[PDB]
């Protein structure tokens, strides 16, 4: 009835001792073991893990015999561990940082290759001072924007093949099927995200082009100011009165500068509206008046240089009575 059948039981010996070769690999084995998996699985994956070993072993001995040259095979092992570790999702990484480092560097140098890249890297680079931590910045959202949309180009283009599948498509129906949340809702996110991202590259476009200095480049209330004392500055009545003029003629045209940019941006606004058009009509006229305007205050802010220069040395000192 009971059919002792068997029941071995010897003293036990070595409660403990070296599993793997490599520390690292028992440490992965622990992990494992705390993880606690189905029998089937446990012994599927440490088979797994096992071979893993045994094809490093393996590609020791194919360099000594002096075969492998590409480094494909290292390059697949490398690649396995990577797909292994993502399909279980244990490629947990957090920030830190130690405050050593290597410091070492030494590969090739890389950075802008596109030339449409450098126009904007450049750009910002010396259009003011948009420093490797500030054009870092943006090459963070530049980047985002290359693999967030890669990945919806990439999955399109991936379930895109999936349609042309023995060449059909048609179907007695005017709009497939909906039930609700399965084909417009898929059309939904189509315009939501790439609309999301298409207004992503004007923001970029608007801040470079708008998300910049603002306010007077000078118009400051010292240097001016100064001038306007002059005439509180104690000066004679042949001075004062040449001056009086002399300010006076200097206000209105930096007003009237003012004036002209105001209808230059307008004018900018139209001359892209009426390019639309696509008949290339307007659009040598406004072109025209568009340099000619640029022209007049690139020349009103030289003037002004100039003039600033002048009357700051004359001004300096009205020594010769009325200079």
Known sequence: YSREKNQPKPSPKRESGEEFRMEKLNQLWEKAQRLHL???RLAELHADLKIQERDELAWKKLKLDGLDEDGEKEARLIRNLNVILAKYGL???KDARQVTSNSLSGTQEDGLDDPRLEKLWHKAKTSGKFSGEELDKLWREFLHH???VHEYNVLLETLSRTEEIHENVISPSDL???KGSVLHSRHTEL????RSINQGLDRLRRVSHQGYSTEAEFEEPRVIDLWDLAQSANLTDKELEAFREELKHFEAKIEKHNHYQKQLEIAHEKLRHAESVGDGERVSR????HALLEGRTKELGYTV???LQDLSGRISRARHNEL
């Open 38 to 40: 189905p029998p089937v």
């Open 146 to 148: 290359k693999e967030k």
């Open 191 to 194: 315009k939501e995200k790439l």
């Open 305 to 307: 240089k100039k003039h």
């Open 286 to 289: 406004s072109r025209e008046k």
């Open 91 to 93: 490629d947990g990484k």
């Open 176 to 178: 497939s099927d909906i």
